[PDB]
Amino acid sequence: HEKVTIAPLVLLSALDHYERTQTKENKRCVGVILGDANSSTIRVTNSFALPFEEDEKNSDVWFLDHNYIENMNEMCKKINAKEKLIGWYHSGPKLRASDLKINELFKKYTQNNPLLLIVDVKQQGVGLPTDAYVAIEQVKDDGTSTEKTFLHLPCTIEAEEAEEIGVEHLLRDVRDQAAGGLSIRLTNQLKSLKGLQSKLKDVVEYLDKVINKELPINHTILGKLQDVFNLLNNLQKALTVKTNDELMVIYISNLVRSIIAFDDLIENKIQNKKIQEQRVKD
Amino acid sequence: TKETVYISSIALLKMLKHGRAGVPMEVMGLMLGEFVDDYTVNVVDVFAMPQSGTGVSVEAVDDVFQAKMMDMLKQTGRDQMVVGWYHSHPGFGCWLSSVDVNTQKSFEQLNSRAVAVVVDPIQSVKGKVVIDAFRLIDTGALINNLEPRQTTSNTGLLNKANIQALIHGLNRHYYSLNIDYHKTAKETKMLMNLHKEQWQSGLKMYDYEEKEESNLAATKSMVKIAEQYSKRIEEEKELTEEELKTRYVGRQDPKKHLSETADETLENNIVSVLTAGVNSVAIK
Amino acid sequence: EQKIQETELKIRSKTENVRRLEAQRNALNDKVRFIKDELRLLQEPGSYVGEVIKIVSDKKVLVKVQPEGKYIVDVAKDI
Amino acid sequence: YFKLKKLEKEYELLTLQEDYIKDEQRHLKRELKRAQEEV
Amino acid sequence: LNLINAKLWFYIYLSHETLARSSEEINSDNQNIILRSTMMKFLKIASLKHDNETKAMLINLILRDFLNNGEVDSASDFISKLEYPHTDVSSSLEARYFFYLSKINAIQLDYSTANEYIIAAIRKAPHNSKSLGFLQQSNKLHCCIQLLMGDIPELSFFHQSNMQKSLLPYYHLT
Amino acid sequence: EGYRLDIIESALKSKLDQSTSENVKIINYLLTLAITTVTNSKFRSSILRKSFDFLMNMPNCDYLTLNKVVVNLNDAGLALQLFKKLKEENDEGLSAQIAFDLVSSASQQLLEILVTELTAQGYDPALLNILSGLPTCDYYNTFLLNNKNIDIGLLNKSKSSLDGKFSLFHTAVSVANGFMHAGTTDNSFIKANLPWLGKAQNWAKFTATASLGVIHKGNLLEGKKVMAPYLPGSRASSRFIKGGSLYGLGLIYAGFGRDTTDYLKNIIVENSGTSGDEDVDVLLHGASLGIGLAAMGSANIEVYEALKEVLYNDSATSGEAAALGMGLCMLGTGKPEAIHDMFTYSQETQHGNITRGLAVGLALINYGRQELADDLITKMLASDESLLRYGGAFTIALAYAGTGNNSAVKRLLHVAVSDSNDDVRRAAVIALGFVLLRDYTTVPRIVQLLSKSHNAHVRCGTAFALGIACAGKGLQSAIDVLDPLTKDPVDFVRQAAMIALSMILIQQTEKLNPQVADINKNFLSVITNKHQEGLAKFGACVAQGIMNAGGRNVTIQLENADTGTLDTKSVVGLVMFSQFWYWFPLAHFLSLSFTPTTVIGIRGSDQAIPKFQMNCYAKEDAFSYPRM
């Protein structure tokens, strides 16, 4: 399986360049990743910055240096020669279509499979706004043509021995790692549903886009939204007879053994009673 | 006469990827930033030096490597002034290196604001950055006697033995500094939301419940099989009529035979509460 | 007046709970401190154990080390 | 009568000394393993 | 507070069931009207800032007086004043709560409730002078409830407390 | 708590008794709690004026009750009518009977109105210098000199030991010399031997020149004129020397605002554009802090505007010193305009002392605002920066001295216990000493948990409260509390106890404090032992110098027992005195907090001290002169 693992320094290195040149509001900052991967698994650790500029009115305006930016990789080659160019990362807040046209220029200098990440200047979402792209030829059922498109894959943040405790040493404020972490994650799971519910509000706007003037309709999106009914809701009521019994067994074994282990603290009164007998010298 | 060292979060961890977990044969590099001497110190932009067979050498100090790096400063938009150099040494108790100071001496006359911050890749395993600094005399009483480290009380520098007590006589060649860390608003809550503990785990709805078919009965076997043994062992150990207290086995013998069994009952009760009930979020 | 009596009756009720909050806090204060004490106490390579054949009047003691020969050493103020 | 103004001394001691330690108990437990694993 | 006990006036009603020597001061029982207000005289003394302990033991003996005389419908009205924190239980309280109150279920026609409240009669029931007198009535109300829903564990197990001849007809009812 | 105006006048008519001054004690019982118990500002303003005209008509009554009226109102209208009715008798002792107690009663706003504005109001011109604050510290210059009995051998033991660099021997001994000789105008110790006078360092001379800002306190011409070559017309070196001359210059003055108005302003204006040299920062550093004298107790726009251009020079020397003067411009309720300006500049400059200095000034702008200042306090506590949390404590507790509010303390609990940061934890300690002024026995109770844990700053904030409420009063339960704080080799933990050991032991002798002999070794023998650190030797002379300052004639008391209120210069001086972290030479601010214990007589006409026999105690075993 292809799983992109991103180092958090990539987000911090680009965050500095967003403040310096004041790059934001539909302005993409192009960058390149680094690592050694001969397998499908992609490991992203070090990253560079490409001085890219674009126009907001014209999405076809792009300028990228080929061998002038690779001097940073030549300087890093003498540092670490094990890692080479495995891909590249962009910003794309509105996801410009310039990356769809040419997949060759970025693949010429990267011998690995084509990979395109997303680093926004905002990245303030509680969810997982960081997304990965794989550019291949995929068959489309929309009825137009089969061409190179983006393939989405899940990614995450890398933690190694260097930066694991380094970030925790900087924060050292709110951690709270215990059995009580269920209330934080399950609430975030509810926020994940509410986060997708906010994405469903964009689906509400998707119909308004059809209501708008001269916009097409994507047939691929309709295929996924068509099965939302027959899948998973009074249809499941027939299976709720044997399903509720499985949830009750969890409560049966839990409540009988939960009141046992808590009865071993009786020694508190026993030790406190012996303290009064030790008061002869007190 | 006295200074204080402050290092941001971005400039904190770069080489320590190679230093800490990137095994020995350490590298060096340049630090950048802007500050005012004798009061505060700031480090922002950092990039390392190339690695050779002999490690730190003249080729790493040579500006031919930096010539192409300075061109990347204005292109990437990140550019500052030289605040010093950084190195690493495998935890030498006394006199880490005298070569890195010679590089500091030649670059001191052209800057005088340069600060040499070295970190131990060996003893940093605890997660705390080892604090050491080499600097030329600032406004000199150091040619004879002076006390570095503004707020001379501060906290005991620890370290080991030798160079701790050599501060007084060798102060000309050794200038002590207390290194502190700081981070801005975009470096505080922005990274915390994506890190916290372990990873951020995007799309929290992903769990192991979708993988549960035969493992549901396996969970029912773990809350029974291993639990039946904890019931008999708890009574078997308590049945002993010896007592006598004193020492005997009481360091921890009884935990596994008495108290850990209560925790072993809890270990299967934690995974029971882990998914708990109705983890499908209401619906049907 | 009830405001005089009711205020005093709420003291002894919450007194015992606060006393054990400090005992549990002091119990944790002897843990992390014992953690930091392991740094200074372990600076030395360790300690040796041997058998005492006899004692002297010089405030010393003869201890026979197992891997090595017999050594006359000094005791402490607790023995 | 005048004692009523002084009855709020010991009454406010146990209230301020209660939640002070209760929150700290969760911090000391988390900060325990930080130094525990440090050594 | 602690200077008042429930045994102060507890010796009054003990003379009413004799029906031989005392029987109040007259057979008309007209003095109990003042005694009815005298039993409740300490209830008015019980207030927000008064009787944080003794108030628990006030209604009890008054409610224990409602068996053959006095309104038992006021006990439903006593629920409003029945809510208090329980300070402590010492020795003989456990048998003195629901013993006489185990007969409340003889009106409302209820069964499963009698199982929970019949234990109060058998807890610390035997005493020096209460072994013959008050222990017999414990198993008489306990054995009949055992025939309402559950079963009797043993016929001879109840002989150590109550006389088997007293529970003999209940064994034939089995 | 009822706030009923009718009965206050009605119940007063119910009591017809008119010793008239002793009968006011009944009236004084209700009017004494108007500050402590009553938290409402309307109870004070709209009521006390009723009883004001009642005792003014017949001039025989207790005047201590009316002294507490003009304290928190900040209104000179009542002090204006007190001198009009008493003018009919034309008695300088009757008309000024109330005015003599207005030094610590009325604020600095009323005292300025009672000098200039009363010229045409028919007020005695010979009484003008009294309300200005002159007959306060001037009486104590003799009280700390002719009655001063000490042993030089105590200081002479530390005279020749070793020569410390940085500050050390050139400061700890100099600051001790500053305290010991404070009020006596005795410079002879500094001039004892030549060599150690000129071997001092840069910032050591900064303290050496500022050490004379204490001994010379309570003067006018002798303040800056002690050292000739450090005054214009002659120069010494190219490094920092004269910075201390203007640093502790305002400490010598009695509160004169017209002496430093035009002298320190021209230096700031010329240096406002660019400071490129060292000597430019020498005069500008001291001129930034001392310029607040003209802005002290009154709104001054010139001081607020002139110090703003200093922050644009990118200098951490006079930057933080200019931030203190900007906060001293507004003493009172304050204005939101000056608050938002200092908050905006915090995100611009990169200096730490300037960024925190803007947060320190926010607490000085609001005086007496209390709960209405929670909007600014919430904004400061919501930021992640450590330097932006300062006044979240000192601003809350001002009038809360004595009996306080548990809600103000509760807000400082969860913030300090959850965060281990130094600036966040040390900030809440400031308000702890103000709330514990009610009972000294309860001081080692609430904060008692601070010494039960193991940490530097956790144990450092322990004895800070013991040096405030338990200092002059003393307690027998504070002995074993300071025992574990001494054995800790950490300097800040050891210094915290030494601050308590110094302040609690003020005015102690045989049979008063039998443990003074063992604690004495902590302020001396620590210098002999070289195993300790610098602050242990630094604080040895400083803490010892606090007790014998002025010959053990002065102590530290924030709240006076007369009016039951605090002091302007005593409260603000102790807050910045205990922080050695960002600015070391802050030890000079302790001079404004010195309050001695004595009874001063006042003559009717010229208001001098008559020479007669006073009756207090004739023995040495209760209250006497402590010595070796």
Angle ∠(A68,A72,A77) on CA atoms, nearest 5: 125
Q: Name every residue whose Cβ is closer than 8 Å to that of residue A150 and which is 6 or more positions away in sequence.
A: A99, A100, A116, A133, A134, A135
User: C15 to chain F nearest CA, in Å?
Assistant: 14
The residue type of F41 is S
Chain centroid to CA F195: how far? 35
The residue type of A180 is G
Q: What is the CA radius of gyration of chain F?
A: 25
CATH class of A1-173: alpha beta
Residue F448 CA to residue F452 CA, distance in Å, equals 7
Other C-beta atoms closer than 10 Å to the C-beta of A86 total 22
How many CA atoms lie within 13 Å of A69's alpha carbon, on the beta-carbon side? Answer: 20
Other C-beta atoms closer than 10 Å to the C-beta of F551 total 23
Residue A244 CA to residue A83 CA, distance in Å, equals 53
User: B91 to chain A nearest CA, in Å?
Assistant: 17
The residue type of A204 is V
Question: Would you state the structure tokens that stand for residue F122, as one six-digit string?
Answer: 């028919």
Q: Which element (helix H / strand E) includes F378?
A: helix F374-381
- Do residues A52 and A27 make contact, with C-beta atoms less than 8 angstroms apart? no
Tell me the chain F residues in contact with residue D23 when contact means C-beta distances shorter than 8 Å.
414, 417-418
The DSSP symbol for B190 reads: H
Nearest CA in chain A to F421: A173
SS3 F206: helix
Q: Which residues of C touch F (CB under 8 A)?
A: 22, 25-26, 29, 32-33, 36
Tell me the chain A residues in contact with residue D30 when contact means C-beta distances shorter than 8 Å.
175-178
Tell me the chain C residues in contact with residue F454 when contact means C-beta distances shorter than 8 Å.
29, 32-33, 36
Other C-beta atoms closer than 10 Å to the C-beta of F198 total 7
Q: Give the pairing type, strands B116-119 and B133-134.
A: antiparallel
Residue B257 CA to residue B15 CA, distance in Å, equals 49
**In a mutagenesis test of the D interface, which of A175, A177, A184 is the best target, namely the one with the most D β-carbons within 10 Å?**
A175
Residue A43 CA to residue A5 CA, distance in Å, equals 5
Residue A61 CA to residue A88 CA, distance in Å, equals 19
Annotated binding site of B: 87, 89, 100
Q: How far from F308 is each of A126, A143, F315, F326, F336, CA to CA, in Å? A: 41, 69, 12, 8, 17
Chain centroid to CA E34: how far? 22
Chain centroid to CA F574: how far? 5
SS3 B36: coil
Q: Name every residue whose Cβ is closer than 8 Å to that of residue F554 and which is 6 or more positions away in sequence.
A: F140, F144, F182, F594, F595, F596, F597
The DSSP symbol for F561 reads: T
**In a mutagenesis test of the F interface, which of A168, A170, A173 is the best target, namely the one with the most F β-carbons within 10 Å?**
A173
- Do residues B274 and B222 make contact, with C-beta atoms less than 8 angstroms apart? no
Q: Do F449 and C33 touch (CB under 8 A)?
A: no
The DSSP symbol for A119 reads: -
- Do residues A236 and B284 make contact, with C-beta atoms less than 8 angstroms apart? yes
Q: Give the pairing type, strands B179-181 and B5-7.
A: parallel
Which of F426, F288, F263, F282 lies closest to F354, judged by CA? F288
Q: Which long-range contacts (CB under 8 A, 24 or more apart) does A51-56 make?
A: A51/B75, A51/B76, A51/B77, A52/A28, A53/A27, A54/A27, A54/A28, A54/A96, A54/A98, A56/A26, A56/A27
Q: Which element (helix H / strand E) includes F355?
A: helix F352-365
The DSSP symbol for C52 reads: E
- Do residues A128 and B202 make contact, with C-beta atoms less than 8 angstroms apart? yes
Flag whether residue B39 sits within 8 Å of chain F, measured between CB atoms.
yes
- Do residues F44 and F38 make contact, with C-beta atoms less than 8 angstroms apart? yes
Residue F548 CA to residue F554 CA, distance in Å, equals 8
Tell me the chain F residues in contact with residue D17 when contact means C-beta distances shorter than 8 Å.
446, 449
Q: Which of B145, B153, B185 sits opposite F533 (nearest CB)?
A: B153
User: F488 to chain B nearest CA, in Å?
Assistant: 12
Q: Which element (helix H / strand E) includes A137?
A: strand A132-137
Q: Name every residue whose Cβ is closer than 8 Å to that of residue F113 and which is 6 or more positions away in sequence.
A: F76, F79, F80
- φ and ψ at residue A31, rounded to 5 degrees: -150, 170
CB pairs under 8 A between C and F: 12
Question: Would you state the structure tokens that stand for residue F31, as one six-digit string?
Answer: 């009017």
- DSSP assignment of F222-260 equals TTT-S-STTSTT----SSSSTHHHHHSHHHHSSS-SSSS
The DSSP symbol for B130 reads: P
Burial class of F517 by CB neighbour count within 10 A (0 to 12, 13 to 18, 19+): exposed
> Which ranges in E15-167 belong to alpha helices (H)?
32-39, 41-45, 54-64, 74-77, 93-96, 105-108, 112-117, 119-122, 133-146
Which partners does chain C have (≥3 C-beta pairs < 8 Å)?
D, E, F
Chain centroid to CA F23: how far? 35
Which partners does chain E have (≥3 C-beta pairs < 8 Å)?
C
Residue E16 CA to residue F575 CA, distance in Å, equals 78
Q: Name every residue whose Cβ is closer than 8 Å to that of residue F513 and which is 6 or more positions away in sequence.
A: F474, F505
- φ and ψ at residue B118, rounded to 5 degrees: -110, 150
Q: Give the pairing type, strands B29-33 and B46-48.
A: antiparallel
Tell me the chain D residues in contact with residue F442 when contact means C-beta distances shorter than 8 Å.
9, 13
- Length of chain E in residues, anyone? 174
Residue with tokens 């009695």: F254
User: E59 to chain C nearest CA, in Å?
Assistant: 23
Residue B259 CA to residue A242 CA, distance in Å, equals 37
Please name the method used to determine this structure: cryo-EM
Which partners does chain B have (≥3 C-beta pairs < 8 Å)?
A, D, F
SS3 E86: coil
- DSSP assignment of F434-474 equals HHGGG-STTHHHHTTHHHHS--HHHHHTSTTTTTTTTTTS-
Q: Do F495 and B153 touch (CB under 8 A)?
A: yes
Residue F283 CA to residue F271 CA, distance in Å, equals 9
Q: How far from A249 is each of B264, B267, E74, CA to CA, in Å? A: 19, 17, 45
Strand order of the β-sheet with A116-118 is A31-32, A88-90, A116-118, A132-137, A148-153
CB pairs under 8 A between A and B: 188
SS3 F112: helix
Between positions 7 and 36 of D, the ones with CB within 8 A of A are: 26, 29-30, 34
Residue C41 CA to residue C54 CA, distance in Å, equals 30
- Percentages of chain E per state (helix, strand, coil), in multiples of 5: 45, 0, 55
Q: Do B141 and F239 touch (CB under 8 A)?
A: no
> Which ranges in chain B belong to alpha helices (H)?
15-19, 58-61, 63-76, 99-106, 162-165, 189-194, 215-222, 225-238, 254, 260-275
Q: Which long-range contacts (CB under 8 A, 24 or more apart) does B278-284 make?
A: B278/A247, B279/A186, B279/B207, B279/B209, B280/B209, B281/A189, B281/A190, B281/A193, B283/A232, B283/A233, B283/A236, B284/A233, B284/A234, B284/A236, B284/A237, B284/A240
The DSSP symbol for B259 reads: I
Tell me the chain C residues in contact with residue F406 when contact means C-beta distances shorter than 8 Å.
none
Flag whether residue C59 sits within 8 Å of chain D, measured between CB atoms.
no
Q: How far from F480 is each of C30, F30, F476, F508, CA to CA, in Å? A: 19, 40, 9, 18
- Do residues B45 and B11 make contact, with C-beta atoms less than 8 angstroms apart? yes
Q: Give the pairing type, strands A42-43 and A4-6.
A: parallel
User: D38 to chain F nearest CA, in Å?
Assistant: 16
- Do residues C62 and C50 make contact, with C-beta atoms less than 8 angstroms apart? no
Flag whether residue A166 sits within 8 Å of chain B, measured between CB atoms.
yes
Nearest CA in chain C to E49: C2
- Percentages of chain D per state (helix, strand, coil), in multiples of 5: 85, 0, 15
- Percentages of chain C per state (helix, strand, coil), in multiples of 5: 50, 20, 30
For residue D2, is it left (φ>0), alpha (ψ between -120 and 50) or beta? Answer: alpha
The residue type of F156 is N
Q: How far from A172 is each of A169, C28, D30, F80, F89, CA to CA, in Å? A: 5, 19, 10, 58, 72
Between positions 178 and 197 of B, the ones with CB within 8 A of F are: 185, 188-189
How many CA atoms lie within 13 Å of F57's alpha carbon, on the beta-carbon side? Answer: 4
Tell me the chain C residues in contact with residue F452 when contact means C-beta distances shorter than 8 Å.
22, 25-26, 29
Q: Do C2 and E52 touch (CB under 8 A)?
A: no
Which partners does chain A have (≥3 C-beta pairs < 8 Å)?
B, D, F
- Do residues F55 and F89 make contact, with C-beta atoms less than 8 angstroms apart? no
The residue type of F84 is K
- Do residues F389 and F359 make contact, with C-beta atoms less than 8 angstroms apart? yes
Other C-beta atoms closer than 10 Å to the C-beta of E121 total 24
User: F383 to chain A nearest CA, in Å?
Assistant: 14
Tell me the chain F residues in contact with residue A173 when contact means C-beta distances shorter than 8 Å.
418-419
- φ and ψ at residue D37, rounded to 5 degrees: -75, -20
- Do residues F31 and F48 make contact, with C-beta atoms less than 8 angstroms apart? yes
- Do residues A156 and A142 make contact, with C-beta atoms less than 8 angstroms apart? no
Q: Which long-range contacts (CB under 8 A, 24 or more apart) does E28-37 make?
A: E36/E70
Strand order of the β-sheet with C50-55 is C50-55, C60-65, C70-74
Annotated binding site of B for Zn(2+): 87, 89, 100
Q: Which element (helix H / strand E) includes F492?
A: helix F491-504
The DSSP symbol for B131 reads: P
Q: How far from B153 is each of B156, F84, F385, F539, F581, CA to CA, in Å? A: 8, 58, 24, 11, 9
Nearest CA in chain D to F408: D16
Question: Would you state the structure tokens that stand for residue A57, as one six-digit string?
Answer: 């009115």
- Do residues B121 and B171 make contact, with C-beta atoms less than 8 angstroms apart? no
